[PDB]
Design an enzyme around this catalytic site. Structure first.
Site, PDB file in Angstrom:
ATOM      1  N   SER A   1     -30.668  39.044  -3.607  1.00 33.62           N
ATOM      2  CA  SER A   1     -31.437  39.633  -2.503  1.00 33.62           C
ATOM      3  C   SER A   1     -32.682  40.254  -3.142  1.00 33.62           C
ATOM      4  CB  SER A   1     -30.589  40.706  -1.795  1.00 33.62           C
ATOM      5  OG  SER A   1     -31.222  41.302  -0.647  1.00 33.62           O
TER       6      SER A   1
ATOM      7  N   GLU B   1     -27.635  31.125   4.189  1.00 33.04           N
ATOM      8  CA  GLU B   1     -28.463  32.289   3.967  1.00 33.04           C
ATOM      9  C   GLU B   1     -28.923  32.999   5.234  1.00 33.04           C
ATOM     10  OE1 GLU B   1     -28.852  33.787   1.250  1.00 33.04           O
ATOM     11  OE2 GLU B   1     -28.634  32.454  -0.468  1.00 33.04           O
TER      12      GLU B   1
ATOM     13  N   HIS C   1     -25.077  35.329   2.833  1.00 33.51           N
ATOM     14  CA  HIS C   1     -26.043  35.936   1.936  1.00 33.51           C
ATOM     15  C   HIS C   1     -25.337  37.158   1.388  1.00 33.51           C
ATOM     16  CE1 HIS C   1     -29.992  37.523   0.724  1.00 33.51           C
ATOM     17  NE2 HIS C   1     -29.762  38.638   1.401  1.00 33.51           N
TER      18      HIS C   1
HETATM   19  C1  LIG Z   1     -23.400  40.697   5.731  1.00 35.68           C
HETATM   20  C2  LIG Z   1     -23.539  42.048   6.208  1.00 35.68           C
HETATM   21  C3  LIG Z   1     -24.254  43.020   5.473  1.00 35.68           C
HETATM   22  C4  LIG Z   1     -24.889  42.729   4.203  1.00 35.68           C
HETATM   23  C5  LIG Z   1     -25.628  43.672   3.278  1.00 35.68           C
HETATM   24  N1  LIG Z   1     -25.678  45.029   3.649  1.00 35.68           N
HETATM   25  C6  LIG Z   1     -25.943  45.709   4.938  1.00 35.68           C
HETATM   26  C7  LIG Z   1     -27.416  45.802   5.291  1.00 35.68           C
HETATM   27  C8  LIG Z   1     -27.547  45.658   6.788  1.00 35.68           C
HETATM   28  C9  LIG Z   1     -28.276  46.801   7.404  1.00 35.68           C
HETATM   29  C10 LIG Z   1     -29.728  46.439   7.625  1.00 35.68           C
HETATM   30  N2  LIG Z   1     -29.844  45.994   8.982  1.00 35.68           N
HETATM   31  C11 LIG Z   1     -30.926  45.445   9.558  1.00 35.68           C
HETATM   32  C12 LIG Z   1     -31.439  44.119   9.353  1.00 35.68           C
HETATM   33  C13 LIG Z   1     -32.524  43.656  10.158  1.00 35.68           C
HETATM   34  N3  LIG Z   1     -33.082  44.524  11.088  1.00 35.68           N
HETATM   35  C14 LIG Z   1     -32.660  45.848  11.303  1.00 35.68           C
HETATM   36  C15 LIG Z   1     -33.325  46.654  12.289  1.00 35.68           C
HETATM   37  C16 LIG Z   1     -32.901  47.976  12.501  1.00 35.68           C
HETATM   38  C17 LIG Z   1     -31.808  48.508  11.719  1.00 35.68           C
HETATM   39  C18 LIG Z   1     -31.157  47.729  10.764  1.00 35.68           C
HETATM   40  C19 LIG Z   1     -31.549  46.348  10.516  1.00 35.68           C
HETATM   41  C20 LIG Z   1     -33.094  42.223  10.060  1.00 35.68           C
HETATM   42  C21 LIG Z   1     -32.137  41.229   9.355  1.00 35.68           C
HETATM   43  C22 LIG Z   1     -31.673  41.890   8.024  1.00 35.68           C
HETATM   44  C23 LIG Z   1     -30.837  43.165   8.318  1.00 35.68           C
HETATM   45  C24 LIG Z   1     -26.235  43.143   2.092  1.00 35.68           C
HETATM   46  C25 LIG Z   1     -26.051  41.786   1.739  1.00 35.68           C
HETATM   47  N4  LIG Z   1     -25.321  40.966   2.569  1.00 35.68           N
HETATM   48  C26 LIG Z   1     -24.743  41.348   3.766  1.00 35.68           C
HETATM   49  C27 LIG Z   1     -24.006  40.347   4.519  1.00 35.68           C
HETATM   50  C28 LIG Z   1     -26.607  41.185   0.481  1.00 35.68           C
HETATM   51  C29 LIG Z   1     -27.097  42.243  -0.542  1.00 35.68           C
HETATM   52  C30 LIG Z   1     -27.948  43.258   0.195  1.00 35.68           C
HETATM   53  C31 LIG Z   1     -27.076  44.006   1.181  1.00 35.68           C
END
Ligand SMILES: c1ccc2c(NCCCCCNc3c4c(nc5ccccc35)CCCC4)c3c(nc2c1)CCCC3
Ligand SMILES: c1ccc2c(NCCCCCNc3c4c(nc5ccccc35)CCCC4)c3c(nc2c1)CCCC3
Ligand SMILES: *[C@@H]1O[C@H](CO)[C@@H](O)[C@H](O)[C@H]1NC(C)=O
Ligand SMILES: *[C@@H]1O[C@H](CO)[C@@H](O)[C@H](O)[C@H]1NC(C)=O
Ligand SMILES: *[C@@H]1O[C@H](CO)[C@@H](O)[C@H](O)[C@H]1NC(C)=O
Ligand SMILES: *[C@@H]1O[C@H](CO)[C@@H](O)[C@H](O)[C@H]1NC(C)=O
Lengths: 528, 528
Positions: free
Chosen positions: B197, B324, B437
């Site tokens: 990432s 991804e 991912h």
């Molecule tokens: C499945 C579930 C969670 C994951 C994760 N951590 C959790 C991080 C999620 C919170 C951010 N969550 C968000 C995202 C977006 N918009 C947001 C808009 C508002 C608040 C949060 C948002 C656009 C798409 C990307 C994510 C991570 C990874 N894979 C995952 C695979 C790969 C390494 C980095 C962290």
């Protein structure tokens, strides 16, 4: 006496002809128009002055003055298309194959040959209507029309050479069938016009032209549609090309009256000899003199007409062949020859796309390339060859036809679609050419039914199925006898396969590629 | 005593840790920088003032102040990524897992976590280096760096908040490993940095930045590359967003000194609470504060640097995962939920493409659509879902990475490429998400080797193969031990599959789609 018929134009004497161990009648060479010679060349046809005495309709007429292909001198594969009669400007005749005993009032099918509007005769052995007439109890007519400059020289505004006259020729033959076909046992209220190549484009054009709509019942288009890129030009471009033709022959270019009088003096072969010289260099797969959107025969653009429903509403049966592009590539794109496997090089693949779309920038070319390139293997000669084959096919025949059938179906009364992909066992052309443009015709006219021609027994089966679909449709508006060929609907877009395997229905014929050619590419060329 | 080490910065006391029925050393929480708190926030890291006395390096340090995901409260699938320590701005620490007996001078691997530059900790159970350290006799380091506004707020020109400081944090940890890793038995001349990432993007960025090139030997990038669309912004856009952040917190916007002093007064959670509010609406899959092309850390544009060969020349091992895009769609495109099959509608498929490419007109959208639509079936929810999945994947991770590996290979000294497509037997996320991912990480760190985690015996095999490739590469520049993973060349573009079936080599990873995303689409958006 069957061989004698009395028409509104004169008595006519036909002849008895042998067919599949039986016999039928054949009235060859009946004149439907006044010889378009001398001061007549380039003018609308004039109807034939009636005559007394019986007209000898025992032998095929002359073929119209046209370009004769000598790319492969002596080769059957190409000579079967060349005129097999004497060429003359006095060539406006039709032929009739009447079942025996003469019918009282049966299904009529009128054949319009193709040849890109630069070639074609009604007397070719592939167009012998005796087998279809006989095997299906239908009266079969084959007409003729002027081609090349002779039938399409267009100087909009002039009445001496308004253009589209070859189409009027066609219409005159059709008018004649409407007025006299009953005397041969044909029912004027059930005539189906069918054609291939420019003939299919022509069929479509009588569906569009108000002046033609009432002379026939249903239509069949084979590998040709009115909107095909090679089938028409603006009055602007037509005039441009007409002037240019005089420039090639040393003609006073002062006025249309001048231009036309010189062009009218030249011997036929003189116009043929320089006629491909007016074709602009960004039109490698098209021909010089073709139908013009003149506002009369064609009230408006084909596109608006197709769009508004401005056209005859009836049932139609049309289709295309597997490898529509091979012919065009063979005769017009370097690197494709009759005797090599004609494998193409990546470097060369791109010169073929650039060659098949001059009306495109480095973006539109990239777009065509990305769409037909196999990105993992791409240095493969065969695939590149086949890629160019599909590009030229899709773009020149198949996608224009699919666009026409999509538009037509919206207002029509029944659409039937086919995809002929059988490669005849005795094909003399090379393997890489596949199922060639023009090669379903053999099966439609039933040449397979004759053993001497070396076809397989199953190909005699395929031809018989096709001949029966064609005639059954002409007789009812439905190819199927009361294993079903489904109607093509705007929703389910079903169509069948025509070949020796047992019938199988499919959906959305080359949609992917045609959505590219029909909707995407245009938007892109415009938006850039 | 193994647990005691003397570094250039101070004595450090580690702790013994159990691993797969054995034990190893672990120095947790070693400080490599001065707490970036108070008047320090937004500034370049300062190196840690040395210390006397032994430093307790027995327990994990604090996690950096970051956004905490609560989309699925309590769900393991998402909580495994959240910080599992106490969040604090005093978080610049690294961890070390040293084999036992302590090595004399062995292979070093330094892990850089990801999290889109808005989240991430070095203490997650998925990042436990004990298994990899132990199973491969390598010294394993995991660093930490400020994220979100704290590590990426960019006001170009200011020295109080120049930007990219999170990357400098990383570099400081790397400098520390270069200076002290020998004391733990690691060979500073053989350190491999690896990340996934934003960590992979970060790895790539130290390959590019001249100031970082000399602190490591080789690199490994997992599902991230420096040029990814979500990994960087211009100083212009960074400033725009920094101002906007003050507007969200009621800050004097008079000058940078003003802006920064208020931002510096706010409690951490205050910046986190409004930080996604500065993200422009045409950047749905990106995050607010990211690396800036500032001319210092990044001398010029990443593209020119990639193009001129302006970057560290060494061996690199990188790759991507099957699906991804599912993560991005789940968290940012409506219609995709954790508990439905999330089937998508044609009408909705197009709102997703419009959603994944605002930087495109009705022509560029059509182009994306034509490229991912299955024209014969197209009303199919699954296919539409999967189509959007591939679009977001290809565009956000895979194609940027492939563009990077193509450019890198031209000047590099050996490239290794993988395509991880195994779906863990115990995955808690839904079926439609596929190979997610972030989910190859489990296997890279060897969680499968522990039975309690319910993996299959073959997955213990896959993890072991991967762990050995990763460490063998770190140790030699070649994943293969002296069934071979082939070098990726500009010509043959070979790569392998990482999964439970027996290894198979392939060619040109998603070329078709990446030639669309990398070469075609850009030309088109520009040419319109
Ligand atoms: C499945 C579930 C969670 C994951 C994760 N951590 C959790 C991080 C999620 C919170 C951010 N969550 C968000 C995202 C977006 N918009 C947001 C808009 C508002 C608040 C949060 C948002 C656009 C798409 C990307 C994510 C991570 C990874 N894979 C995952 C695979 C790969 C390494 C980095 C962290
Ligand atoms: C200069 C001189 C001649 C040219 C030319 N040949 C024209 C001669 C070929 C016609 C033979 N007559 C043919 C027909 C059909 N299929 C064939 C299939 C294979 C070979 C000949 C064919 C379908 C019905 C219409 C007639 C062609 C072109 N450019 C030329 C430039 C561009 C591609 C189309 C043909
Ligand atoms: C019809 O014309 C052909 C032309 O050669 C001739 O051979 C034939 O005998 C003619 N038939 C009659 C009875 O006029
Ligand atoms: C054709 O038209 C007739 C009436 O004009 C109608 O009953 C028939 O169902 C139509 N068929 C189709 C396919 O439109
Ligand atoms: C190290 O710090 C932890 C923090 O709670 C503490 O529990 C542990 O006893 C400390 N070890 C020593 C010997 O200082
Ligand atoms: C790596 O570089 C060395 C010399 O710098 C050379 O001998 C070796 O073959 C190179 N390998 C590749 C794949 O470039």
């Amino acid at each position: 006496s069957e061989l004698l018929v009395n028409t509104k134009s004169g008595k006519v004497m036909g002849t008895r002809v042998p067919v599949l161990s039986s016999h039928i009648s054949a009235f060859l060479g009946i004149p439907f128009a006044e010889p378009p010679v001398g001061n007549m060349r380039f003018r609308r046809p004039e109807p034939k002055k009636p005559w007394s005495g019986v007209w000898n309709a025992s032998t095929y007429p002359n073929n119209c003055q046209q370009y004769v292909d000598e790319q492969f001198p002596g080769f059957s594969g190409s000579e079967m298309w060349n005129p097999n009669r004497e060429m003359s400007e006095d060539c406006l005749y039709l032929n009739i194959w009447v079942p025996s005993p003469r019918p009282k009032s049966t299904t009529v099918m009128v054949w319009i040959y193709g040849g890109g509007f630069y070639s074609g005769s009604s007397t070719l052995d592939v167009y012998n209507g005796k087998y279809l007439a006989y095997t299906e109890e239908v009266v079969l007519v084959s007409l003729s029309y002027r081609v090349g400059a002779f039938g399409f020289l267009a100087l909009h505004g002039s009445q001496e050479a308004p253009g589209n006259v070859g189409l009027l020729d066609q219409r005159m033959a059709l008018q004649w069938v409407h007025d006299n076909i009953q005397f041969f046992g044909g029912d004027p209220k059930t005539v189906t016009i069918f054609g291939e190549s420019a003939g299919g484009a022509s069929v479509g054009m009588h569906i569009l032209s108000p002046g033609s709509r009432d002379l026939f019942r249903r239509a069949i288009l084979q590998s040709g549609s009115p909107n095909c890129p090679w089938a028409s030009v603006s009055v602007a471009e037509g005039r441009r090309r007409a002037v240019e033709l005089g420039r090639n022959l040393n003609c006073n270019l002062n006025s249309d009256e001048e231009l036309i009088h010189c062009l009218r003096e030249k011997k036929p072969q003189e116009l043929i000899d320089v006629e491909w010289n007016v074709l602009p260099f960004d039109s490698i797969f098209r021909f010089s003199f073709v139908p013009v959107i003149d506002g009369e025969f064609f009230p408006t653009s084909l596109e608006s007409m197709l769009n508004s429903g401005n056209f005859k509403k009836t049932q139609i049966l049309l289709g295309v062949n597997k490898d529509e592009g091979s012919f065009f590539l063979l005769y017009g794109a370097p690197g494709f020859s009759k005797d090599s496997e004609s494998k193409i090089s990546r470097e060369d693949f791109m010169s073929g796309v650039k060659l098949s779309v001059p009306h495109a920038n480095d973006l539109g070319l990239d777009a065509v390339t990305l769409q037909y390139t196999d990105w993992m293997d791409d240095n493969n000669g065969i695939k590149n060859r086949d890629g160019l084959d599909d590009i030229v096919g899709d773009h020149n025949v198949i996608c224009p036809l699919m666009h026409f059938v999509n538009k037509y179906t919206k207002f029509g009364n029944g659409t039937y679609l086919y995809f002929f992909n059988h490669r005849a066992s005795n094909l003399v052309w090379p393997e890489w050419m596949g199922v060639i443009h023009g090669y379903e015709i053999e099966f439609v006219f039933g040449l397979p039914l004759v053993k001497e021609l070396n076809y397989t027994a199953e190909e005699e089966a395929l031809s018989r199925r096709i001949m029966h679909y064609w005639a059954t449709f002409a007789k009812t508006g439905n190819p199927n006898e009361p294993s079903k060929w489904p109607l093509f609907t705007t929703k389910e877009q079903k169509f069948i396969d025509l070949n020796t395997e047992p019938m199988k229905v499919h959906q959305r014929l080359r949609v992917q590629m045609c959505v590219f050619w029909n909707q995407f590419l245009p938007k892109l060329l415009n938006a850039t």
